[PDB]
Design a binder for this molecule. Structure first.
Ligand code: MG
Ligand code: MG
Ligand code: MG
Ligand code: MG
Ligand code: MG
Ligand code: MG
Ligand code: MG
Ligand code: MG
Ligand code: MG
Ligand code: MG
Ligand code: MG
Ligand code: MG
Ligand code: MG
Ligand code: MG
Ligand code: MG
Ligand code: MG
Ligand code: ZN
Lengths: 199, 190, 176, 52
RNA sequence: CCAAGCGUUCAUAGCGACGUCGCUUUUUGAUCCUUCGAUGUCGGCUCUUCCUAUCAUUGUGAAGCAGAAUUCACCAAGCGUUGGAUUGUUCACCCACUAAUAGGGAACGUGAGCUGGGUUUAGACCGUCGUGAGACAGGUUAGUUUUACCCUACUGAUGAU
RNA sequence: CGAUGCCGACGCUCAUCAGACCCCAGAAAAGGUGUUGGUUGAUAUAGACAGCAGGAUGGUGGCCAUGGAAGUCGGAAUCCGCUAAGGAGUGUGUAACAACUCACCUGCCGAAUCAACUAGCCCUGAAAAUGGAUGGCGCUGGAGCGUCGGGCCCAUACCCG
């Protein structure tokens, strides 16, 4: 149902373009670890780009917008909002089909995360080019929860490591079991090999 | 123009041990270990031979800027070899026309206190980098000896002292006072 | 002329129209690299006009035919002598390319002259094309492939099938 | 008074420099172009004038 | 920008001829596109904001920078940039204090914000001009300054999902 | 935002003001040892170009011009000997002594090096006033620039009805 994406190692704009089209077609999208997102170009020039954005404010009443969100999740959310017709009912409904998070809170912490190879930095950037981290960028333009997100992301990874070790334990048993019942499943294994399901 | 291959080799002394974990070099020698990460350069590191051990750095299909990083890695690694065997010793002389520069070492050579620099009442305190030890040279007056295993740490520690004693709002061509690096040597001569 | 697609080498023969003064005018030939023959004949009249008191009206094309590559399955080094106009002058160049067909080396020349000098094909006049032996080549980019034991890897192999799948559970691998 | 050897040590860091004519940057004595982009890496350098 | 000269010496610390390339729209022009069933025409006062081509202050580089004082240049508009005599004045000049007393824009910011000294109606005087009626980017004196309760913005006050 | 979600082709480019499509809505002269490509000319296996020695004098401190300049500040001349070589002199210093460094040369090590031009992209030159516009988001194995391929998208145009 819901397409869950991992924000780590993805380029801001490319992910937004793909994410924007998915929610316009009616799919629910969740993006996690928005602080792991990357932007091409060195950090300083990306920091300048946002500091220029911070200068844009209604001279007569700054409370009337633009609103300069400092969380990497909201920065990404506003980037996806920039690729949608968000002043029409169609665009706002699409925008409601996207959820954006810093770190991986529940229930997405215990769910498989997909990536978008067309937006992956390793796929789209020459390895010599400089790049920026949305988390460091956000932290340096007023985001207040970099340290807490990291602290909680450190606890989740420790739990994920325990889960993986249990999965590896169950696969070691599975391979052992396939050896103990090799005679009882030989006929069914030829059917799979005959049809490519087992090489 | 991209050049098919560009490589340079480093010869490892028999008393030094080099191990690679990807692009991380670990040089272990008589004076300790150094570890440096070259993950920011897309090269290929190899260890050749078993008796006369060498380290090769290769760069395939590099441009002019990329090729220039092949020898930079080699020089760094040599400095790491030089560090774990001979060490780095930076000697600094304090120059003053009227006011002696009184230097007091504290915390086993990890904190340098400078007093009376051009007569100032302010006390300057410079914290050495980890793994660097400063001491007053017993062989000569007005001379500090910075010793360590990492050239970047040792030579950066001396830079802090030299910039701490900076003259201000004067003609520095005239007011030459300061503590300056006077020699870049090794801890053990060989 | 627009250097559209891979160019072809054409052998074009023309002459002045016979007249009472000279009942048999001499024949002239040109090596023309063009997309098709209709372009090939047009460029012939542009070149002979520059060298002779001749033009399409007072002359005819005796033969237009494609010159096929003689060793399409053999690697060769090509030397190309050309003149071109820049924004602020005219220049002569000598360039080298490694290819299998002489028309391929010329096509590489147009794409290369466009890339490195923003030269549109209407400003480029290829004067001469020769096949050159490995010992007589001057350009370091070409000479580095003159190595009987050449070998090299393919580092950081970029993923080109980036939308099949568009969304995947595993991250790609660039090492092979 | 400073010993002549120590005078040369300090002068190595305070006097033996080139000066960019366009941006006044302090450069090493063997510099042929400035290291600053603000001047476009110009080659208009001059010696740091000696104090009399 | 070039560099003949100046700078005792020395083109380029600081300047810079003869030449030449630009930028700005805080000067004046040129034009007449909008407005003549009317967009209130100078200056001041008050109040906020913005620019930088930076006077002061912070951090710096260069001097023909010994110190002090000063000059050139960089990042830089955060914070300042005043009290007065004469004048309607903008502009100017001087007195005094100051770290400094920088320069500008916002319909040459700002008249349902004021004032009305000037300009620019009708009265009147002088000079020059005209036979005269009369005229004068020539002086002089006296000469009504309208309306918000509407929409928005803004300031505060109830409140609404 | 309809259509490249092509396993598109070859290059160029990093910008702490990048660039991005007739009219058109922004930039010049002049510069860069950033990077790429070219033209010309040199020198190097009789082993070049850095890097690691000596040499400042024999006629002579050439005579003129000097209060005084010995190679060293100007104005015309600017020769030989011994030799691996040595300008009758590149830079060092005053009011004069005094002073040293290059031209030169060979000891060393062993493949390309040097100079001047030229043209692409980038960069400096590059300062304005409400907050601000390659249309926006954004984009750097390009969603930028140059040369080119298939494919696809849709006008009230073209074809059949
Ligand atoms: Mg706040
Ligand atoms: Mg002073
Ligand atoms: Mg003079
Ligand atoms: Mg008209
Ligand atoms: Mg009206
Ligand atoms: Mg009005
Ligand atoms: Mg009105
Ligand atoms: Mg400024
Ligand atoms: Mg006004
Ligand atoms: Mg008003
Ligand atoms: Mg009024
Ligand atoms: Mg009045
Ligand atoms: Mg009147
Ligand atoms: Mg009269
Ligand atoms: Mg469009
Ligand atoms: Mg019909
Ligand atoms: Zn400079």
């Amino acid at each position: 149902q819901v397409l869950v994406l991992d924000g780590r190692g993805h380029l801001l704009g490319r992910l937004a373009a793909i994410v924007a089209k998915q929610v316009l077609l009616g799919r629910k999208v969740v993006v996690v670890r928005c602080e792991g997102i990357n932007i091409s170009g060195n950090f300083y020039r990306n920091k300048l780009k946002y500091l220029a954005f911070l200068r844009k404010r209604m001279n007569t009443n700054p409370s009337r917008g633009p609103y300069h969100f400092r969380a990497p999740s909201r920065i990404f959310w506003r980037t996806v909002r920039g690729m949608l017709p968000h002043k029409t009912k169609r665009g706002q409904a699409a925008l409601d089909r996207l959820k954006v998070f810093d770190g991986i809170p529940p229930p997405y912490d215990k769910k498989k995360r997909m990536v978008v190879p067309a937006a992956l930095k390793v796929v789209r950037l020459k390895p010599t080019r400089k790049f920026a981290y949305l988390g460091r960028l956000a932290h340096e333009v007023g985001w207040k929860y970099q340290a807490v997100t990291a602290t909680l992301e450190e606890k989740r990874k420790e739990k994920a490591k325990i889960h993986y070790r249990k999965k590896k334990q169950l696969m070691r048993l599975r391979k052992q079991a396939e050896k103990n019942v090799e005679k009882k499943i030989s006929k069914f294994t030829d059917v799979l090999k005959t049809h490519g399901l087992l090489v | 123009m991209k050049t098919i291959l560009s490589n340079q080799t480093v010869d490892i002394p028999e008393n030094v041990d080099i191990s690679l974990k990807g692009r991380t070099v670990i040089v272990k020698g008589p004076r300790g270990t150094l570890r440096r990460d070259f993950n920011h350069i897309n090269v290929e590191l190899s260890l050749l031979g078993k008796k006369k051990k060498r380290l090769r750095v290769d760069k395939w299909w590099g441009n002019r800027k990329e090729l220039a990083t092949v020898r930079t890695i080699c020089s760094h690694v040599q400095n790491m070899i030089k560090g774990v065997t001979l060490g780095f010793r930076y000697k600094m002389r304090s120059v003053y026309a009227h006011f002696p520069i009184n230097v007091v070492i504290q915390e086993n050579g990890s904190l340098v206190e400078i007093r009376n620099f051009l007569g100032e009442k302010y006390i300057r305190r410079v914290r050495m980098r980890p793994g660097v030890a400063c001491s007053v040279s017993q062989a000569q007056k007005d001379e500090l000896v910075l010793e360590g295993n990492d050239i970047e740490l040792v030579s950066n520690s001396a830079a802090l002292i030299q910039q701490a004693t900076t003259v201000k709002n004067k003609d520095i061509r005239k007011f030459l006072d300061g503590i300056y690096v006077s020699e870049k040597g090794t801890v053990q001569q060989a | 002329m627009k250097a559209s697609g891979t160019l072809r080498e054409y052998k074009v023969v023309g002459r002045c129209l016979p007249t009472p003064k000279c009942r048999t005018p001499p024949l002239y030939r040109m090596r023309i690299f063009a997309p098709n023959h209709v372009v090939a004949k047009s460029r012939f009249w542009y070149f002979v006009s520059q060298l002779k008191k001749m033009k399409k009206s007072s002359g005819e094309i005796v033969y237009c035919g494609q010159v096929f590559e003689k060793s399409p399955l053999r690697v060769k080094n090509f030397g190309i002598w050309l003149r071109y106009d820049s924004r602020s002058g005219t220049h002569n160049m000598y360039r080298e390319y490694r290819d299998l067909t002489t028309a391929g080396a010329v096509t590489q020349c147009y794409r290369d002259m466009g890339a490195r000098h923003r030269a549109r094909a209407h400003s480029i006049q290829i004067m001469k094309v020769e096949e050159i032996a490995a010992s007589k080549c001057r350009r370091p980019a070409v000479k580095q492939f003159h190595d009987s034991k050449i070998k090299f890897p393919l580092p950081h192999r970029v993923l080109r099938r980036q939308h099949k799948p568009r969304f995947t559970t595993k991250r790609p691998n660039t090492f092979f | 008074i400073i010993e002549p050897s120590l005078r040369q040590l300090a002068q190595k860091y305070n006097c033996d420099k080139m000066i960019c004519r366009k941006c006044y940057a302090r450069l090493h004595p063997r510099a042929v172009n400035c290291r600053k982009k603000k001047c476009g890496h110009t080659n208009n350098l001059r010696p740091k004038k000696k104090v009399k």
